[PDB]
Design a binder for this molecule. Structure first.
Ligand SMILES: O=P(O)(O)O[C@H]1O[C@H](COP(=O)(O)OP(=O)(O)O)[C@@H](O)[C@H]1O
Ligand SMILES: O=P(O)(O)O[C@H]1O[C@H](COP(=O)(O)OP(=O)(O)O)[C@@H](O)[C@H]1O
Ligand SMILES: [Mg+2]
Ligand SMILES: [Mg+2]
Ligand SMILES: [Mg+2]
Ligand SMILES: [Mg+2]
Lengths: 346, 343
């Protein structure tokens, strides 16, 4: 009964889909049964209609239902992700990746969902590769990385091979669509907490709704300068997800003594340049990049706390203390070194 | 210009800049657009809501790439009778029947046409079933027009470069802005027409495109949804003359037309719809004849607008259309059309 003309017609009529229709569509896409034209029409039509949390949740659900999972009982109940949509139009250093290393060094289990560049000069995966970290590990070895090192990296194309038809279309049309939301929503380890960047201000709330439905503890963040991270150049909008509900907040780092930075102070380069930036921060270099890394690490720790009960300002103060200490003690630098060793000993 | 630029502008619900729609269409027409890009553009353009300028650019590009007719072979007063189709009703081929009657009345007709998309039989299918050569090239359409009084430009024959767009249309199977282009891309470029639009909220856009060309056109939408002048109720007419458009409500009851039911205009496959043509041309009285005469008269009114007064124009149109059938001229013109193609 479901068909492309039905679903696409409903969307072009600016109507929300019926329950299960978005899922049907995504499943057709993920099983190689959709024509490129159908994939593109669907992505564009959903985007222009304004996707609902129900709809985006169905898309992400289908992706997760096809993904390679991690082995049973290898992901702690309190694992966290630090990942964004990307596509903010700014070539920054890899802030989520740097933050993730610091969070893990603070003792919070991290299973990060990641990928190579799409529109930037160096993606988190590119940069980790340049640092000597193995980005190509399957379920079993990601699980061992998490256990042994404190952090695992799930390379999206490795865990989502059936997404390859959609990815090709995303590339061909260029324009961001609802598909650009799915990465942060489809970590195959299914961590229940996260700091989740959204480049698209008008779609952050919908992302937050999806996390709320699965009762995650997440901060969905959009820098008011456009960054899909908590920014240091100005305020950030946060959609705070806890206990199945979303509430919208504005966050000002000046409240925690952060000086305002300029966006060009966070600029990145190629994989080697961004790798150097990771080494500089973990080595104790003070300055704007460190500040942005500590701020986002703290945010992820706050999300982790919310799995409990948790109070906002004490949570942030503790998160900032822990993030800063994880760098200052050398723990974060050492953790990266241990991560690199781990991959070379497989 | 680029796909990310243009698609991004559309997904931001912004009208395009001058020339951008044309750039896009030309990419599509030169085989330089990926199916995904074709599909994204068609959907994005549709959901943003296209403007007359934009649709005009699209049609302009198609006409640039189309096979033209030979110089000085289309009369300045040639008329088209063609609609968007996709009105969700499987009717007999009212435009095609009206076209024959109009030609038989002596008004030069160069009809743009095609096979079925959503229906059981398109005008081209029905003409084929009647024995008409539908796939003639430019030289022979011009001869048909001169010698028979009607020519049929088969869209696939004259718009080869459109095949990639056509394939994507079929694949996504939902109407888009592309569904507006048929009536706007007759390669003979007739300056008058009776032009049906299934999509009430886009008829004004189509009328705007014709206004830009200073065509004399009646863009029509039956208030029952028909992409023809209907006989079951009133119709909306976007009348185009002197580069301006005015919206009218039209009731054929004012000309003595009894109200019909939509089911009475229902059609079927090419053989059945061909039989309906033969029936009407043979003098059969009924709702189908009425609808044919009404739309034939509409086209004659548009032809007259190249120069007349509205109500007198309609009276004359109805008279000429009825007489074209009743004298047998219409039936004989069809026979002559068939013989032409065989020789
Ligand atoms: O090249 P763009 O278009 O900007 O997209 C990149 O940002 C995404 C999220 O990046 P991450 O948040 O995972 O990592 P990071 O912030 O850089 O450390 C990555 O999947 C990558 O596709
Ligand atoms: O099958 P659907 O979806 O209805 O579309 C058909 O109607 C178009 C216009 O038809 P016409 O107006 O040219 O001819 P007609 O009214 O039928 O005599 C044709 O190109 C054909 O694609
Ligand atoms: Mg960026
Ligand atoms: Mg990030
Ligand atoms: Mg119809
Ligand atoms: Mg018609």
């Amino acid at each position: 009964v479901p068909s492309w003309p039905q679903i696409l017609g409903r969307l072009t009529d600016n109507r929300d889909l019926a329950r299960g229709q978005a899922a049907w569509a995504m499943d057709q896409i993920m099983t190689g049964n959709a024509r490129p034209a159908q994939i593109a029409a669907f992505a564009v039509a959903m985007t222009m209609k304004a996707p609902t949390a129900d709809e985006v949740g169905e898309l992400a659900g289908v992706m997760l239902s096809h993904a390679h999972p991690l082995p049973a009982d290898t992901v702690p109940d309190d694992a966290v992700d630090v990942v964004g949509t990307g596509g903010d139009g700014v070539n920054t250093v890899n802030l989520s990746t740097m933050a993730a290393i610091v969070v893990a060094a603070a003792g919070v289990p991290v299973v990060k969902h990641g990928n190579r560049a799409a529109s930037s000069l160096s993606g988190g995966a590119d940069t980790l590769e340049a640092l000597g970290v193995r980005i190509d590990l399957g379920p079993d070895l990601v699980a061992r990385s998490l256990a042994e090192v404190g952090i695992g990296f799930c390379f999206a194309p490795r865990f989502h091979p059936s997404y390859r038809h959609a990815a090709a279309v995303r590339r061909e049309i260029g324009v961001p669509t609802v598909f650009n939301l799915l990465g942060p929503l489809t970590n195959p380890a299914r961590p229940r907490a996260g700091l989740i960047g959204c480049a698209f201000a008008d779609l952050a709330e919908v992302m937050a709704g999806v996390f709320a439905a699965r009762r995650s503890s997440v901060l969905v963040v959009h820098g008011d300068d456009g960054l899909d991270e908590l920014t240091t150049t100005t305020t950030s909008t946060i959609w705070r997800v806890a206990a199945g509900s979303v509430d919208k907040l504005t966050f000002d780092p000046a409240g925690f003594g952060f000086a305002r930075a300029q966006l060009d102070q966070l600029a990145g380069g190629d994989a080697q340049a961004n790798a150097a930036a990771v080494r500089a921060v973990l080595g104790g270099a003070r300055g704007p990049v460190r500040d942005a890394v500590v701020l986002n690490a703290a945010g992820a720790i706050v999300a982790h706390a919310g799995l409990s009960r948790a109070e906002w300002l004490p949570a942030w103060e503790e998160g900032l203390r822990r993030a800063s200490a994880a760098i200052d003690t050398g723990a974060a630098e050492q953790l990266l070194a241990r991560w690199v060793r781990f991959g070379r000993q497989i």
